[PDB]
Design a protein around this ligand. Sequence first.
Ligand code: HEC
Ligand code: HEC
Ligand code: HEC
Ligand code: HEC
Ligand code: HEC
Length: 385
Amino acid sequence: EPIHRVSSELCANCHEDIYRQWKGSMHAKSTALSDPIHGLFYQQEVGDPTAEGMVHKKSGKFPLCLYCHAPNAARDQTTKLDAHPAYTEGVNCVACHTLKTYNGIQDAEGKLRYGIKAYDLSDRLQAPIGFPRELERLKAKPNPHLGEPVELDGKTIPALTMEANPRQLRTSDACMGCHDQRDNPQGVPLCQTGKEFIAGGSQVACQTCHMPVAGGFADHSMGGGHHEAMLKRSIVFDLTTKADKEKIAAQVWIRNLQPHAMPTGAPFRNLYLKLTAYDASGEVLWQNAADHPSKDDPRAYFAYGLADDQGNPAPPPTATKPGDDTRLQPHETRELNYEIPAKGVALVRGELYYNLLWPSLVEKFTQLPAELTAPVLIAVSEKPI
Ligand code: HEC
Ligand code: HEC
Ligand code: HEC
Ligand code: HEC
Ligand code: HEC
């Protein structure tokens, strides 16, 4: 009966195109039931997503994950995510479309309020325009948003009452409760897409890039790191070479097209550059990094780490200080210079790889689907010599 427990399948009766986009997105796959990466961490940090009364294994509190990953379950104070479509559907139509007023993530006493807790919620759907039809009433597909139930194809559709809310729906208020920041228990940022967005100074709403008008309405696919086309668009990558004595001076230019860091969001996202010089038989003559750049060429590893009081790497739950951050900064163009011995080199090839998880985690959790965990080739540049 309450709007937040209405299944996305009901909406799909009249918004099939948006439904199709949404259903394939990580928003629809956000729960520990549907995303095996999040599920592995949820099991380790909280417990079974098919159990009621679960708490965080350290804090003993209602699991904070759910505020962002299973909003309608958190709205109903339940941890049993398989009990109802409102919970299995993750960040679903009504989860986003019942957010009314964004209060910010930090309250006046400094308490962090995540996900649905950063908002006043409505029992009415919230829309960018709604149906401002008072003038038409004053003068005087089926639409269930006009104050009454409607019949569709012989089936009664309940009233799905709606309010216009342009400031919520058209600005970053639509995203920030879940995407601004998340800190560990010592206050260290884990995710910090909002602080990055502030620092970089952009005035573009997340939707302008992430909900583009295509085919005449706002695209709900909202792909990021799970979507290779988006990742290839997300940077400009180029390789230049000049002669330099008996070396080849190779310049790798990487421009971040985003107003947040690249890669933003989860702390384990990372990129790395492989730059390789080959002879004319295709045999390797030189490489920037023999194996993984994190170990062999740190300037070519673009990542965030956390640290202990000593500055040394620490697991995210116990870290007390940010570690180094070599990710591309908002709208940054990074130049990396290499000096390659020229003898026999016929081809210099640069490759930029994106990864959902740190290599430590990929090496450990080898039962995760290999399609998830494999490096993603997101840019290539070749120069013949
Ligand atoms: C038909 C029986 C519908 C059902 C079921 C739902 N909606 Fe709807 N919606 C309907 C119409 C005819 C329209 C107008 C435009 C169109 O697509 O033909 C809408 C519009 C919306 C909007 C946008 C309003 C705006 O600002 O322009 C939203 C945000 C919306 N609808 C959401 C929504 C949700 C979340 C649903 C399930 C809970 C849902 N609608 C069902 C018709 C029908
Ligand atoms: C948050 C991640 C959302 C989810 C999940 C869904 N919608 Fe959405 N929708 C959202 C925003 C912020 C906006 C406004 C975009 C802007 O910047 O203007 C919308 C818009 C709609 C519309 C209007 C589309 C248009 O006329 O171009 C409709 C009809 C709509 N949304 C419906 C809808 C349905 C049916 C969903 C589940 C399948 C759904 N949305 C999920 C934010 C989010
Ligand atoms: C265009 C100028 C953008 C604006 C405005 C914002 N984002 Fe973005 N974002 C953009 C691209 C091209 C990509 C792909 C790169 C990628 O890493 O996937 C992204 C990606 C994200 C992601 C995924 C990050 C990851 O794990 O790799 C998220 C969570 C994201 N963007 C969020 C986001 C939010 C909340 C925004 C407004 C504050 C926002 N983006 C603006 C391009 C653009
Ligand atoms: C909480 C209720 C959210 C709101 C509101 C928005 N997003 Fe979201 N987003 C959320 C989660 C929990 C996740 C990850 C789920 C998982 O298990 O991986 C996401 C993910 C994204 C992504 C990345 C998609 C990918 O390919 O991995 C992007 C680009 C994204 N979200 C964008 C985005 C925008 C632009 C929003 C406002 C319009 C928005 N999200 C709202 C949780 C929530
Ligand atoms: C909102 C403030 C969130 C809270 C609280 C938690 N998570 Fe989350 N998570 C959130 C978003 C917006 C995203 C997408 C980030 C991006 O870069 O695109 C995520 C992602 C994850 C991931 C990665 C999932 C994947 O790549 O498929 C994991 C492993 C993850 N979150 C786990 C997790 C757990 C275990 C939480 C509670 C302890 C938790 N998250 C909370 C937003 C939010």
